[PDB]
Amino acid sequence: MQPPYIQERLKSLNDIETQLCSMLQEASQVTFIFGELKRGNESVKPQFENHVKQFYERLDKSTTQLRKEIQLLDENVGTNKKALGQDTEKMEEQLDLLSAILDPSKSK
Amino acid sequence: KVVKPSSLNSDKIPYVAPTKKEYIELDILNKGWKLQSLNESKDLLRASF
């Protein structure tokens, strides 16, 4: 499996696009609510401020976190290799098989 | 081929005397079509989203 650092990096990226999807959804609801606000019912007027504020705060911190990720790219620089040992490990397992062949009491 | 072209010549006609009659209705009905455009704007944006 990959080293953990890459794991939380990909988790943060996934959070980033989920936040973008949430921003698009909230844009959909604010566009929806503005229609009836133009229609002329004032009951949903208080919800408009909350929706706008949450939309803007969702737009800002997502870009901020993505900026942090791109910054991490800046200092992460400088921080078949398996083949060099690959034959060796193959060697090992083959002899292990011979051991299983060599002992008739373990072939069950 | 239809005709030798000299067709359009400049001419003068006076502007019609204004009143309350037609501008207020023109602008409120423009308000109407733009409220329409807002409605289809919201609908198209909702469908796209």
Side-chain angles (χ1 to χ4, degrees):
Chain A
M1 212 55 228
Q2 304 102 20
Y5 198 97
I6 299 102
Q7 285 170 334
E8 70 270 14
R9 286 281 83 74
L10 65 92
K11 298 291 180 68
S12 82
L13 267 296
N14 282 129
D15 186 74
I16 282 296
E17 70 267 13
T18 52
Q19 193 167 350
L20 299 176
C21 302
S22 64
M23 183 278 288
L24 294 174
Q25 191 60 261
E26 190 172 0
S28 65
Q29 289 89 21
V30 65
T31 311
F32 182 76
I33 190 167
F34 186 80
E36 81 257 15
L37 294 174
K38 197 51 184 180
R39 285 328 195 201
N41 48 1
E42 321 315 339
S43 62
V44 285
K45 180 175 184 177
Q47 301 302 111
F48 182 76
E49 288 103 331
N50 189 358
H51 288 86
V52 172
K53 198 167 190 175
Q54 294 191 34
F55 173 82
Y56 272 91
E57 68 90 25
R58 199 82 39 78
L59 170 64
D60 306 331
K61 57 183 192 301
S62 65
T63 66
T64 291
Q65 184 57 78
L66 183 63
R67 183 67 148 80
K68 279 175 184 180
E69 283 300 322
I70 309 179
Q71 287 295 141
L72 283 164
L73 294 174
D74 300 331
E75 322 86 350
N76 270 262
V77 56
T79 44
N80 195 329
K81 183 177 288 293
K82 177 180 167 63
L84 274 75
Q86 181 172 358
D87 67 332
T88 288
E89 61 86 20
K90 287 310 184 287
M91 201 265 298
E92 180 79 28
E93 67 90 18
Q94 293 296 335
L95 282 72
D96 305 329
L97 272 194
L98 186 137
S99 83
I101 299 302
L102 191 146
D103 191 74
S105 55
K106 286 187 182 172
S107 181
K108 259 202 177 181
Chain B
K1 298 182 178 180
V2 162
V3 67
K4 331 156 192 176
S6 179
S7 307
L8 262 186
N9 185 12
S10 61
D11 207 339
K12 178 174 303 180
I13 202 166
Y15 183 67
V16 188
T19 177
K20 192 179 76 69
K21 192 46 187 77
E22 58 87 18
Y23 312 75
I24 62 170
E25 285 315 308
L26 185 151
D27 275 329
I28 190 167
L29 204 49
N30 274 314
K31 270 208 166 206
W33 292 272
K34 297 198 86 68
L35 174 61
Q36 174 196 352
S37 178
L38 185 43
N39 188 65
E40 278 85 5
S41 301
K42 179 260 296 178
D43 302 329
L44 197 150
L45 280 158
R46 185 193 42 278
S48 307
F49 292 165

